[PDB]
Subunit: 336 residues, 3 copies
């Protein structure tokens, strides 16, 4: 497309919502290519990541860890206004794995506190993709401070299975998984700091052990449970987008399956089927499609069970509907 | 199917065998859906995991680590009688990754010592699948104490490659891989404990490092070596089912390949081919099919070679038959330059 | 083939080239099956791997870490003369993951200092494959001392996509990724040793933590950066072969993609497409095909960003050509 051709395309402004919810969108593209407009303000803020009051100096796109999911269609343009308020202390930028050139946009978006920038890229490849901050010389520090999210570039005809059959979800959720590296004192107590830079040296020491102190969904232990449990009903089709910008993960829906899983996150790569546990390498997003068949509580986990149940990587689904005794039944309940 | 129709189905009682062997089964389903019945007694038992005599308080389905492989066909029902004898100290249950609902069955099979339960589920999806104990609040501790195994749900028409051609194995082995986290004293020697409970706190500390002290097949360093080495012959087609309920592994047959590998373990996902090293994420089972072409000793390993050769994750195959110099030959044996 | 048929095949000697470069070859096979002859001399030598003068007693096929890429076609034979000079102090051998029998060749190639051996094997399977030394009882120590490389066995008709369309690269690079485990003294300073064996016990202790001290491309931190960046031009098709003989990696071209990725490294397994970050398990090689669309500096990393930017697993590409504003443009440059 020429500059003139791009300037003639319809514009659409999107209002983002906090994960794990996803902003309003259409699965099948509505009309021809558009320039889809998003704005995010970066917030450096303290987050509490466990029930012991452990703090992280988060660097948060749109004030959340992960940043929000942006949804466009293939060959749309994503036009992001990124704002670094004067209240922040560090330079930030953004690299979209979906984008081509300038280190995913990072080279064109370096903004000091009090600056903003506008980046437009063509979403040429369909799939879910990580985005994250990456300031030269301080890249993993920003990423493991929670400065990452994902986007979804849907095929213009929406999702299909490996054989061209349409796959239409009723619900979509975005689970951003975060490895954190929190310094500890002599007694094994987590350290607190009063500015992000104060934590840098101690945090880098922990990072270099390659052993996270916490592995969490949506920024904290137990975040996507209780008031934030994800919901569905028997018969409902659900897409679960999952990202991890720095470290491998192995999602698993306990009590369910990934009926179709784009494990690599890329929609032109046919999905795996009937998955028990799928694998998403650090630096990528993946997506799983499942139709619920049983009601009740599900756990959704990173299936290194130490990571899930000791380090924090466990979410819940609450599913309504009728129990199916054909699929599963207690022939004899626990008894003497 | 209705309760009445399920009641009308044939029942088949299966006698389980200890890994790495697999109970008698037919690759292609014989007749229509059946209710396939299994029984396992859970044993909390001290096991030795290396030649030094390092002990673990294992939590073992059917008394083995891993638990035995159950084999059914797609759309059969698996009916398990699970028994927690009164000699045990902990509540246990079972989660089948093959199953749908109630956390894979865990929500319906919580049994205290002195209790039993019977769970039935429809094996709707073909593949190899992990099963493991998962008591709420104590999940990874049971799993890394060895309380896990796998099942195989064969397609009713047996295995096929990605393009519809039948693949019939001559023999099958099940290799369960176990990450263990054994506490050490100030000398760096492994600690011993009186009851499972006494090891809990020290073990959780090790688990949190995400660094196992041992990574083993069939419950111990070298368990599948010597007179317990797996066997094959040139021309023999072997399926190797491999599971890891908690931690990633990367299987490799040293001197061979995975001709067809269902790396995700799911038979409706076409197999990768000609594999050197495949990848099975923690919480899954995978399966590799290989026709041996050369005789001699092979090592079958997790190809993080530290894990294989320092931590224990190496098994052997002994293979009989004629050497093939077309495939490989020593043109000049090691000799002075 | 019959004995006389094998004996009658042409023999061709090929001169090796140090990584990341690859010796001249044809993508489509020239003529019928050949016995392709290579020679490598093993060098035991101290190398410096970082900016602090940290040393490793390298054990290096052909004098390099990684060992060089050998390229043949399916159903050719690879015939390697492996030489262990008498100035070395350890026994070495070679296991080709591409080969069938005798532990990949290791059982037939155990050479003490002052010995050589010639191994021939038929390259029956197309793909990129790891090779490494593997002396019984000291396997990981040799491998993590850098004694590993890869080969490529091209299909006789060259590479194709999942739909049988030919994929022809303009250039190819071989990135060998090495995990090192360098002992430290109690002050955190890396230790130095007189002879390789002196480091054995201390090194195994580090190895058993499963936490490398360095994760590097081409044998050292920054080996493929700056004036040793890899190069391409907009419009150029590049194959990047990546290996890791002991430990998982997750390659990512920052600013680009893997247009086609044989993540398992095997050409009869259809390539994944449009990849952001692919995954190569320890003990394997993979290959990614990309057509460059934007000029500028790219980084090519293991996308555990701590491994990439704290531990050393980052390379650069310097790409010439014209910027494409359709793919990406700065609508508003960073501004107050
Ligand atoms: Cu990135
Ligand atoms: Cu599980
Ligand atoms: Cu190997
Ligand atoms: Cu940032
Ligand atoms: Cu248990
Ligand atoms: Cu060696």
């Amino acid at each position: 497309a020429t500059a003139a051709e791009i300037a003639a395309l319809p514009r659409q402004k999107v209002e983002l919502v906090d994960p794990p919810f996803v902003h309003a969108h259409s699965q099948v593209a509505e009309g021809g290519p558009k320039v889809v407009e998003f704005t995010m303000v970066i917030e450096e803020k303290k987050i509490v990541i466990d029930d012991a009051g452990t703090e992280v100096h988060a660097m948060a796109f749109n004030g959340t860890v992960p940043g929000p999911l942006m949804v466009v269609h293939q060959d749309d343009y994503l036009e992001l206004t990124l704002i670094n308020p004067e209240t922040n202390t560090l330079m930030h930028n953004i690299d979209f794995h979906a984008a081509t050139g300038a280190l995913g946009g990072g080279g064109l978006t370096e903004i000091n506190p009090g600056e903003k920038t506008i980046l437009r890229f063509k979403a040429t490849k369909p799939g879910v993709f990580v985005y994250h901050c990456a300031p030269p010389g301080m890249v993993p520090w920003h990423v493991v401070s929670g400065m990452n999210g994902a986007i979804m570039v849907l095929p213009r005809e929406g999702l299909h299975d490996g054989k061209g059959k349409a796959l239409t979800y009723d619900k979509i959720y975005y689970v951003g998984e975060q490895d954190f590296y929190v310094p500890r004192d002599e007694n094994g107590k987590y350290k607190k700091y009063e500015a992000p830079g104060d934590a840098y040296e101690d945090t880098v020491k922990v990072m270099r052990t390659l052993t996270p102190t916490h592995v969490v969904f949506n920024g904290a232990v137990g975040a996507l449970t209780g008031d934030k449990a994800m919901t569905a009903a028997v018969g409902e089709k659900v897409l679960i987008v999952h990202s991890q910008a720095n470290r491998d993960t192995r999602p698993h829906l306990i009590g369910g399956h990934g009926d179709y899983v784009w494990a690599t996150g890329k929609f032109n790569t046919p999905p795996d089927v009937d998955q028990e546990t799928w694998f998403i390498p650090g630096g990528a997003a993946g997506a799983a499609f499942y139709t619920f068949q049983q009601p009740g509580i599900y756990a959704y986990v990173n299936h290194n069970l130490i990571e899930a149940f000791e380090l924090g990587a466990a979410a819940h689904f609450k599913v309504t509907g009728e129990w199916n005794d054909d699929l599963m039944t207690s022939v004899l309940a626990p008894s003497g």
